[PDB]
Amino acid sequence: MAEPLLVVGLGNPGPTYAKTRHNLGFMVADVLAGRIGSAFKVHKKSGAEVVTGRLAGTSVVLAKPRCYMNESGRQVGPLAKFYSVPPQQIVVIHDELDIDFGRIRLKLGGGEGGHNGLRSVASALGTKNFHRVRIGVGRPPGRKDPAAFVLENFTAAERAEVPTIVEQAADATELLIAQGLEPAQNTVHAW
16 A cells, blocks of 8 residues: 655756746655655656655655656656556646635646646647646736746745745645645645
């Protein structure tokens, strides 16, 4: 019993892109893994960044693509096969325009803000079914698609609810394994 679930953290390491809101995966996982007693291993290929930590009780594998979102779908595929884990019931932390910054929504689907980061993985797996966690970053105001704006942001307003996301993300991820998704998504909708 107790198979290591695959937790995918969406990160976009780039020249100016490593300082954006697209680095959620490895930026948030850093502090939570450090506390539980977990170090990150660099296995450059499909497992560029992986940490095995156990929250709630069961040990899970948190993988972060250190490549661009374009290449993200190419990371999960081979990695899943190594540990013989089904890439169906996976959780992926990612930023989306679905809601404003402060609260988050964990939902299964892919067609809002980060189309490529959704498409890359969805098209590679040949299906959706992924229940990803969407961090609300708001909808960048403009006559152009947020696609262009979300690649470089410096809005002090996003910083105000950063601590709020931290507490929610760290608690919800553990409670997810502890009981289920309902208690978790109810809490992030309550606070």
